[PDB]
């Protein structure tokens, strides 16, 4: 007649806790049993959502716990592709440091490159260049993040990348 925690119940709440910023609960629900990479039928992981929502404390605690850096969703993205379409640079940083797959592709072929280009995010762009990302990807549409960035009319970020390549 032992009873016990309620893993799948937890598991949500530390989605909740990541998304929104609060960077106790993220601690203490994973010390009470909650699984770091819990996910729902959308497959965001803690770790998605504190990249999308630019936590950077939770993102670095998430993965001090063993959070799946390069985990994927039902859309195929990365917490890196999420982290370079919203605009969260230290967030990239700090990914790549822990092993961020710089060319990783989601369900249309678009790396993080493709999503920081259409979003004009130029810091973004060039750490992502200098981590190893490849400037000639194309996505399933063919296009580059060149291509992207002037469908966009990005005109910045296109002239810049004309050059590279």
């Given at each position: 007649h032992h009873h016990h925690h309620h893993g799948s119940d937890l598991g949500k709440k530390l989605l909740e806790a990541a998304r929104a910023g609060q960077d106790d609960e993220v601690r203490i629900l994973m010390a009470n049993?909650?699984?770091?990479?819990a996910t729902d039928a959308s497959g965001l992981t803690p770790l998605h959502l504190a990249a999308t929502y630019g936590h950077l404390e939770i993102v670095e605690v998430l993965l001090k716990h063993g959070?799946?850096?390069?985990a994927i969703d039902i859309m195929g993205s990365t917490p890196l592709h999420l982290a370079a379409l919203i605009g969260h640079l230290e967030i990239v940083e700090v990914l790549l440091k822990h092993g961020?797959?710089?060319n990783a592709v989601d369900t249309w072929g678009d790396t993080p490159l493709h999503l920081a280009a259409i979003m004009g995010h130029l810091e973004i762009v060039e750490v992502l260049l200098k981590h190893?990302?490849?400037?000639?990807a194309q996505d399933?549409?063919?296009?580059?993040a060149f291509d992207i960035s002037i469908d966009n009319g990005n005109e910045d970020l296109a002239e810049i990348l004309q050059k590279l390549n």
């Open positions: 049993g909650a699984d770091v990479n959070a799946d850096v390069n961020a797959d710089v190893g990302a490849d400037v000639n399933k549409f063919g296009k580059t």
